[PDB]
Scaffold this active site. Structure first.
Site, short mmCIF file in Angstrom:
data_model
loop_
_atom_site.label_atom_id
_atom_site.label_comp_id
_atom_site.label_asym_id
_atom_site.label_seq_id
_atom_site.Cartn_x
_atom_site.Cartn_y
_atom_site.Cartn_z
N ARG A 285 0.91 -1.26 0.02
CA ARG A 285 -0.07 0.26 -0.01
C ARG A 285 0.73 1.14 0.09
N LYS B 21 -5.79 0.78 2.88
CA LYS B 21 -6.78 -0.27 2.82
C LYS B 21 -6.35 -1.58 3.64
#
Length: 169
Positions: A121, A156
């Site tokens: 991420r 996320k």
């Protein structure tokens, strides 16, 4: 038990050899050719080039489809080298083959965990040209490395991230 093998009473086979930077240049054009003529490149070991016609997909015109491919292939090899010097050998046959899939096995190192997820991420939300990092790596680098905050992204939950500028010199 590790090979799915099917007999083909008649297919067409082509081997080429020419025969760092130069090799890759030609082969790309050959690959483009293989796709243009809708033929099938078979992986082989050690720099030799192999194209098949009539397999897996039968063709009423399999030999001549291949012959046409061979003719383009020579016309590309023709020019397109090093100084002014490309020596390409090309061979064709048509006859029975066996084709299919080989079930080999490989072993690779792999890594899992939250750190892998967090790293993923950090990359995919990174600002172009930067190296983005969480708090945990910041803490480990602050003393020896210079870093500047980015702020709070949703990953996320919400995390603070830093850019890694460089070492302290």
């Amino acid at each position: 038990r590790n090979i799915i093998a099917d007999k083909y009473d008649e297919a067409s086979v082509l081997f080429a050899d020419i025969v760092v930077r130069f090799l890759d240049r030609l082969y790309s054009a050959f690959d483009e050719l293989v796709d243009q003529h809708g033929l099938e490149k078979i992986k082989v070991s050690g720099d030799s080039y192999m194209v098949v016609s009539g397999v897996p997909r039968p063709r009423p015109d399999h030999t001549q489809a291949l012959a046409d491919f061979a003719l383009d292939m020579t016309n590309v090899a023709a020019q397109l080298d090093p100084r002014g010097n490309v020596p390409l050998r090309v061979g064709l046959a048509t006859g029975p083959v066996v084709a299919g899939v080989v079930g080999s096995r490989r072993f690779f190192y792999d890594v899992w965990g939250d750190a892998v997820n967090v790293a993923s991420r950090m990359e995919s939300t990174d600002s172009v040209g930067q190296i983005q990092v969480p708090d945990e790596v910041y803490e480990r680098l602050k003393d020896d490395f210079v870093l500047r905050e980015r702020g709070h992204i949703n990953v996320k939950g919400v995390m603070r991230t830093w850019y890694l500028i460089g070492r302290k010199v």
